[PDB]
Structure formats: structure tokens, C-alpha cells
Amino acid sequence: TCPFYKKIPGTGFTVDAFQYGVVEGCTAYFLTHFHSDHYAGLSKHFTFPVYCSEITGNLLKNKLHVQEQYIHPLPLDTECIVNGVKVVLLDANHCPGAVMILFYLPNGTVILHTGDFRADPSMERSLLADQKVHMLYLDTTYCSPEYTFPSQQEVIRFAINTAFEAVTLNPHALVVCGTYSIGKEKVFLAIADVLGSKVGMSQEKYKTLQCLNIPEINSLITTDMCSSLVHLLPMMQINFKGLQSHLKKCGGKYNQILAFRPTGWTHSNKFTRIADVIPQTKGNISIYGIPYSEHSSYLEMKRFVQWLKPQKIIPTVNVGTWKSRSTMEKYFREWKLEAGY
């Protein structure tokens, strides 16, 4: 059965609620983004209307085979009526196609559901500037002050400089980048661009990237592994065993691997600056863990919420323990007393 925080009061609508079977009273199912925890339950046998971005729509049709008649894509930054209710989709600064949804309820209440997001000051000049929000359904993944990490720009600067240095010293090194979902594509795209290479990958991953509306993508990626010195591999293969095994397959073209594992936050964030990050090394194989986040830091979250001044907050992440729920409520009360709403 569908939990409360996935229902939108005063509407026939749910958000990211496909794993509960037919939800009683649901006339339209919203999908914020194409990540498996959120789409869990969709397939070619789904026969209710799905509302989402154009990009999420491309992925539902091609990767999950949802039939076209049930896919309803909406443009961003545009007032749309759905089953007699005004809605707007906004860029969430998460993975490709990810949105936040503004719902303008028939009774005058305004609700923002962030989906998954990485809060940014640019959001303070979207259509959010224009009006009040009574309820905020908030991505609270990193809602605790220990969660610090650098900007995406600094993380990419580090990865580019690391890769370019290593391959310039050794033209016979291969670069490998881990992936398990959409998102974080800038890591592998930026590295390939500095090196003058296309990114090589499996047929399945190539298919997924071809759904994303990335400008000039055909110039950036390929299934021909042999032409490419930046390869993508599933994240589970990014270890000394997996990588040895991959170097065997390359037919003595390369004598060194440098690999990148994009993670979210890890505890080594609490001590080490991005500049000072070092790899794990065994022989001619090195592996860097880099903290490229597509979710708000604590400070980014706090800034957004203090700016929006919502009347009520409903967390959508870390909701399963009493201690988590209590901790989050404490921070919402400080933020409110500090800013005066």
C-alpha cells in the first residue's frame, strides 16, 4: 500500500508510486526521474497515464517499453492543466530529465514536490519567486551538517587534471569510469573531451545515453571499444579484479589503468580536501573515489528552504527511523527560528 508522503491531497495524483499496484483514487501517476527506486513497478503492461519530462518519457518508451499512449511528456517552465489542476515542472539539478513539480490546488494551497534535487541559488529565479508555497515535499538525503562535499565544477576540475596528467606521462594508459544509473555523465564526458577521445561502452549503455537529449552526442560516444581510450563499465567491475580482467581484453593496447568511481558522500569528506584525494593502487591499476553529488549538501538545502519559507515540510528520504525523523524536525525548527518565518 501507498504511503502518505507519496499522495497529493486534494487531487487524484501520486508521485513516484508505481510499486503498490493500482492505487485507489489515482487518476494520474507522476514520475520525477528515471532512477530505479522511483520508477519501481513500471513495465510494458502499465495502462494508467504517466506524467513526466520529455527525457524521462524517452527512457520509459525505449528502456522499459511502456506504450506510447500512456506516456504524457510536459515541457518545463510552462503552466499545464492536468485533470483540471494547474501544474508546472521545474529542473531539479539532479540527473537528466529530473524534475520538481509545483501543484496549484483547487482550494488555493500551493505544493512543491522536489523529487530528488541538488538545490542551487539559480532556483530562487525560477517560477518559484512569484508566489507562496504552503507544503514542501523535500529530498532530505543529506539533511545533517556532517554532510559536506565540493561543487560539481571542482570535482570535474580534479578529474580532468588527474586524467590529462596521467595519459600525458603515459600515452599507453586507459581511463575507465564506473556507472550504474543515469546521472553524473559530466565525469566521463569531460575526461574524454580533454583527451580527444570518444567514450566507449556497451550496447545497453549506449541505448540509455541516446535517450537523453545531449547536444552533439553522436560526436561523443561509441560502441567501438577499440577506437576509444575512455571506457565505461558497470560500477561493480570497478575493483582490482574487474579491472585486471578488463585490461586482458584490450589485446596489449594498454599497460596501465586509471579508474574513477563516482560516489555520493563518504566519511573521508570529513577530513580530506578534494585537492588532497589519493587513489588505491595495485601494480599498474589505480582507482580514485570522487564525491560527485547529485543531491543537496546540508548548507545548500538549508539555504533553499530558508529562502522558500514553506509553512510545512514533509521529508521524503530517511523517513524509516524515529531517530532520523526527530533529527530532521529539529533542524527544520532551527532554520525557521533563525530566519523568522
Interface with Ni ion (CB under 5 A) = 35, 116
Burial category of 327 from C-beta neighbours within 10 Å (exposed 0-12, middle 13-18, buried 19 and up): middle
- Give the cell for residue 10: 486534494
The minimum distance between CB 16 and Ni ion, in angstroms, equals 10
CB of 136 to Ni ion, least distance (A): 18
Report the residue number, 7 or 35, with the smaller CB distance to Ni ion: 35
CB of 116 to Ni ion, least distance (A): 4
Strand partners, 81: 86
In the bound complex, what is the minimum distance in angstroms from residue 174's beta carbon to Ni ion?
29
User: Least distance from C-beta 34 to Ni ion, angstroms?
Assistant: 9
Q: Are 235 and 222 in contact (CB under 8 A)?
A: no
CB 322 to Ni ion: min, Å: 25
Residue with smaller CB distance to Ni ion, 37 or 165: 37
Instruction: Report the nearest approach of Ni ion to the CB of residue 239 (Å).
Output: 24
Which C-beta is closer to Ni ion: that of 14 or that of 316?
A: 316
Q: Considering beta carbons, is residue 6 or 35 the nearer one to Ni ion?
A: 35
Q: Residue 97 CB, nearest distance to Ni ion (Å)?
A: 11
Which of 114/269 has CB closer to Ni ion?
Answer: 114
Identity of the residue, 60 or 243, whose beta carbon is nearer to Ni ion in the bound complex: 60
Edge-to-edge strand list for the sheet holding 7-8: 7-8, 13-15, 28-30, 50-52, 71-73
Nearest-approach distance from CB 171 to Ni ion, in angstroms: 37
Give the residue with the Cβ less far from Ni ion, 29 or 34: 34
The smaller minimum CB distance to Ni ion, of residues 56 and 197, is found at 56
Sign of the dihedral through C-alpha 128, 133, 139, 140: positive
**Closer by beta carbon to Ni ion, 32 or else 162:** 32
Look up residue 141 and give its amino acid: T
